């Protein structure tokens, strides 16, 4: 439902396999309280929006992905369509996460 990415190769393949669908990526870390706080809501959105792909990337598992995607903040949500980054924000803001989706899908 939320699917855990555990390599760059898996990241890239997920973006490919998504086709035209919006992909939402949660970049998180175990030291980030707010990241843990929003995980259930992220999962909720994955169940609500079966037309959107939801991915989790733990920055300490995938330092390369975090670095190549220019992640700076915890959590960061990035948004992709057809392999291209179309949005990003930081912070555990539930309404913003949903309003950004509502804008991009």
Swiss-Prot record:
Outcome of mutating residue 69 to S: No effect on reducing activity, interaction with APEX1 and on S-nitrosylation of C-73. Retains interaction with APEX1 and transcription activation
Marked site positions, Deprotonates C-terminal active site Cys: 26
Source species of the chain: Homo sapiens
Impact noted for substituting residue 35 to S: Loses its reducing activity, interaction with APEX1 and transcription activation
UniProt name for this protein: Thioredoxin
N6-acetyllysine sites (modified residues): 3, 39, 94
Stated family: Belongs to the thioredoxin family.
An annotated Gene Ontology molecular function: thioredoxin-disulfide reductase (NADPH) activity
Gene this protein is translated from: TXN
InterPro entries (alphabetical): Thioredoxin, Thioredoxin-like_sf, Thioredoxin_CS, Thioredoxin_domain
Pfam families documented for this protein: Thioredoxin
């Amino acid at each position: 439902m939320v699917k855990q990415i555990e390599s760059k190769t898996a990241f890239q393949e997920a973006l490919d396999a998504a086709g035209d669908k919006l992909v939402v990526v949660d970049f998180s870390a175990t030291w980030c309280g707010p990241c843990k706080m929003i995980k259930p809501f992220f999962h909720s959105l994955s169940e609500k929006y079966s037309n959107v792909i939801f991915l989790e990337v733990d920055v300490d598992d995938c330092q390369d992905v975090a670095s190549e995607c220019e992640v700076k903040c915890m959590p960061t949500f990035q948004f992709f369509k057809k392999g291209q980054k179309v949005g990003e924000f930081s912070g555990a803001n539930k309404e913003k996460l949903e309003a950004t989706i509502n804008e991009l899908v």
